[PDB]
Design a protein around this motif. Structure first.
Motif, PDB file in Angstrom:
ATOM      1  N   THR A 156      46.992  54.868  47.633  1.00 26.71           N
ATOM      2  CA  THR A 156      46.606  55.295  48.971  1.00 26.71           C
ATOM      3  C   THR A 156      46.589  54.105  49.922  1.00 26.71           C
ATOM      4  O   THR A 156      46.212  52.990  49.546  1.00 26.71           O
ATOM      5  N   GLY A 157      47.019  54.339  51.155  1.00 28.89           N
ATOM      6  CA  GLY A 157      47.064  53.310  52.171  1.00 28.89           C
ATOM      7  C   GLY A 157      48.442  53.188  52.784  1.00 28.89           C
ATOM      8  O   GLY A 157      49.388  53.875  52.404  1.00 28.89           O
ATOM      9  N   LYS A 158      48.538  52.291  53.759  1.00 30.45           N
ATOM     10  CA  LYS A 158      49.802  52.047  54.438  1.00 30.45           C
ATOM     11  C   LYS A 158      50.786  51.336  53.519  1.00 30.45           C
ATOM     12  O   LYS A 158      50.415  50.481  52.711  1.00 30.45           O
ATOM     13  N   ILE A 172      41.605  46.497  55.288  1.00 28.74           N
ATOM     14  CA  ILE A 172      42.148  47.215  54.139  1.00 28.74           C
ATOM     15  C   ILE A 172      41.630  46.616  52.842  1.00 28.74           C
ATOM     16  O   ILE A 172      41.239  47.349  51.925  1.00 28.74           O
TER      17      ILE A 172
END
Lengths: 148, 172, 215, 172, 172, 120
Positions: free
Chosen positions: E20-22, E99
């Motif tokens: 999950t995440g950019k 992040i």
């Protein structure tokens, strides 16, 4: 930006919410710059296109500049390197969250090739002005054999 | 902290809640979530609405003895604000990002956990206790001493029968 | 009453332990200031990162043995039924254990798993010790972290000098760094023997044997 | 990480600790907490004072075998710093805030839970063991294998004394 | 979230993972860690190489039904970026730092904890279940009711053979 | 400069301590320790002590904890040195440290040969 209703929506805090504020909206245009390659000029005014210095660092003197990027390309390998520069520097006047006032400064990025081998392109995408004053290169020059 | 236990029952249709933090204490309206306990388990409430910055009002009065909780759930996978080149930093996003990151940590401090949560490795108790646990339902469940006490008492009851029903044998 | 807790609670030493600070220190004596993030987008940032990683095992190896923290006494491998044993992670060097009634057998390290030249078999079943799991001595490579504070300073200065000569060409800056870093290395190597101290007697087999007799 | 335990054995009056992080580990001098174990539950120590970077001086030497530990307590409600219009952006505050947001995590990461804590939902450890747990005390407390062994041995005891009791009757 | 489970069989040698995440979902290549399921323990694996941005390549194909688990462990002691005045302040560090700080909490939500972890305080679950336990071998381990059923079964058979002994004794 | 060559000065070094490793295992070294050594008093066997990140390590036992190395009727005794910060120093080190750092500072930034040679 909503295309159908041609309305721009913003969630940022612009100040007092009981008044009406004005903003400028329009399209943006890129600024592209490619300085010439550097060749050593002897005191007798003769050139050696093969005897090329190795560029170590490039110093740019600027008076007004927003954040921008510098593109590095190589004519032999084809690899591309991007060095991103910003106008935020710690401890400076233009560090308030309010607004980044236009102030002078300098920026340095490395090249790491022969002068005749690579080119560096200055690209800026920002509504603020971009004023480039002087460009300085620093590196190593090894004369293997003397000039005529 | 994040959760608020509220017992409003009878006539009253609106409840007021206060959260730890700044101002209204939540980033967005969708963060607020309502849970109702039916005496067995918790489930999502229906018919509730957000009256204003604080306090919520129900469409009908809650039944007598009803208990609800007001919780604050925030997105965990994504940062609240993402920054772009050549934009301006505003104090709303900068302060909220710290608030959001502080908020998600506080949620774990209240014992709230997401669905589909299971430990991968065994955890060490370090010489401590387990409290207030019901007797288990399936063999995979844990046990409290109440089940052990009942089994021991049941063992004792048969043992007493073992004695007396063997006692009359002795005089025979 | 009293003032000792009040005044010196504000005191700050701020010792250097992060890898980034070593890079930032390496990023001085050269011009530009250091990078705030290890990754960043600056080419010289990762160039300094490469120098720290390369000079790590070079310095940690000394000549032959490393320091006490690189020591790893008797191991047990018990090679699998499939065949030879694989050496754990990255090892600088592998030496045979030297207990009594143990004949000398050749051990040579290839990629990971080892090789015995005399047997010429890349698997080593028969040269296993009697009821022993091929006891041997080896040397792990610790990362940049998990190291004493002094060796962190020693590795940074040594790497900085190598970065300068590769990047720049200046006699004055290079001369100081090489000389001053060598001062720290000797100032640190002096305590290595001072730690885990050893003496002529006892440790030397022939001296201890002579000591027991005629005494 | 956050906690450091020290066992004093006579004479010694100065004890040292080490919180995780760059430099010292704690932002402010008020973040240090000293607790003493009386053999039953952790109590708050008294008379300690800061006489070093991370070494504390007790008024009197501790008893032999006494066990104490040192904790770092960080604010769990507010962000460390707030940014407002017209002020110099301070990297000292910016660095301190990030440490503050981290230092609360190691507190939670090491299992340090606030008083009055209980998770509101069922938790499963996905086929993982529970270790290092002494026998329970209350009926609502869990029981480990040692209590089960005790009960099982007692069942063997009533079994065997049944055998001796029933066998010698069999001769008549 | 962070951890990804994968099964291997056949000639397949490349496995893909998504966090999950950019973008790639992680900040450093060092954050990727590979584990192999031996069926009994959380053994680590060797011989894996990172061939793509979000994929890994083994040297040899996995055997029949081999199970591997690709997880991502972030830096547990320092913030990702260290900010000082007078440095080249770039915005990417701010995005990466949030992040990363969001990342350190992420696996905690999943259920991973560092080794040498124990809850040293008296925990409470507020009357919630504990499920999915194995039988405990050592006395320090907790027990599910599967053992309790076995012990309850054991006391039943000893009691029923007690009854049959007296039943035939009553014939005498 | 405080660590200098091997052992530091008289105020850096600290005499024997007592760490008493917990039931969990190893003991944690406090903040920054330049070097740690076992106490060399009589009736104590020489056991190697090594410092990893923060808390220490035992190479021979090969385990991260140090519980089996607890001595007879004494928990553990060792000698170490702190690194006290810039303030609360003997005043002599304060001047000594400044010139050494300034001399290095010269050559970080351009300096004349004259300024460098004198300061060194």
């Amino acid at each position: 930006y909503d295309a159908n209703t041609r309305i721009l929506s913003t969630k940022y805090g612009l100040g007092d919410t009981s008044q009406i504020w004005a903003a400028k909206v329009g399209q943006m245009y890129k600024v592209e710059f490619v300085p010439t390659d550097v060749i050593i000029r002897d005191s007798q005014d003769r050139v050696s296109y093969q005897d090329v210095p190795v560029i170590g660092l490039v110093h740019l003197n600027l008076d007004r500049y927003p954040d921008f990027t510098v593109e590095i390309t190589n004519r032999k390998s084809g690899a591309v390197r991007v060095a991103k520069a910003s106008n935020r520097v710690g401890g400076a006047r233009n560090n308030v969250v309010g607004y980044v006032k236009p102030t002078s400064g300098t920026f340095s990025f490395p090249l790491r090739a022969l002068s005749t081998d690579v080119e560096y392109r200055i690209i800026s995408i920002s509504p603020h002005t971009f004023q480039l004053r002087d460009i300085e290169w620093s590196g190593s020059y090894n004369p293997t054999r003397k000039r005529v | 902290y994040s959760y608020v236990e509220r017992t409003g029952d009878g006539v009253a249709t609106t409840f007021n809640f206060a959260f730890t933090g700044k101002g209204k204490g939540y980033l967005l309206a969708n963060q607020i979530y309502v849970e109702r306990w039916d005496g067995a388990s918790w489930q999502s409430a229906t018919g509730w609405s957000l009256s204003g910055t604080n306090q919520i009002t129900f469409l009908t009065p809650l039944a007598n003895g009803q208990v609800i909780r007001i919780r604050r759930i925030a997105g965990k996978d994504y940062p609240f604000a993402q920054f772009e080149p050549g934009v301006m930093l505003d104090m709303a996003s900068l302060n909220n990002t710290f608030i959001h990151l502080l908020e998600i940590t506080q949620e774990l401090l209240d014992g709230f956990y997401p669905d589909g949560f299971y430990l991968k490795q065994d955890l060490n108790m370090g010489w401590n206790k387990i409290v207030n646990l019901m007797p288990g339902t399936d063999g995979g469940h844990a046990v409290n001493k109440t089940q052990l006490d009942t089994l021991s008492s049941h063992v004792d009851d048969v043992d007493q029968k073992h004695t007396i029903w063997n006692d009359r044998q002795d005089q025979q | 009453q009293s003032d000792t807790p009040s005044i010196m609670a504000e005191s700050q030493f701020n010792s250097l332990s992060t890898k980034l600070d070593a890079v930032n220190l390496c990023m001085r004596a050269i011009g530009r200031s250091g990078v705030d993030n290890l990754t960043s987008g600056d080419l010289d940032a990762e160039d300094a990162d490469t120098m720290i990683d390369i000079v790590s095992q070079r310095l940690q190896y000394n000549d032959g043995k490393g320091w006490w923290f690189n020591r790893e006494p008797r191991w047990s491998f018990a090679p699998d039924s499939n065949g030879e044993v694989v050496l754990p992670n990255n090892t600088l060097q592998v030496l045979q254990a030297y207990t009594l009634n143990t004949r000398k057998i050749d051990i040579t390290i290839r990629a990971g798993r080892l090789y015995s030249t005399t047997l010429h078999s890349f698997d080593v079943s028969p040269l296993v010790g009697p009821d022993g799991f091929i006891w041997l001595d080896l040397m792990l490579m610790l990362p940049f972290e998990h190291m004493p504070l002094n060796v962190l300073q020693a590795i940074a200065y040594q790497a900085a000098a190598e970065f300068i000569v590769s990047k720049d060409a200046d006699q004055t800056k290079l001369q100081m760094h090489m000389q001053m870093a060598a001062n720290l290395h000797t100032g640190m190597q002096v305590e290595e023997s001072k730690q885990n101290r050893l003496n002529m007697l006892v440790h030397n087999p022939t001296q201890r044997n002579f000591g027991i007799m005629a005494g």
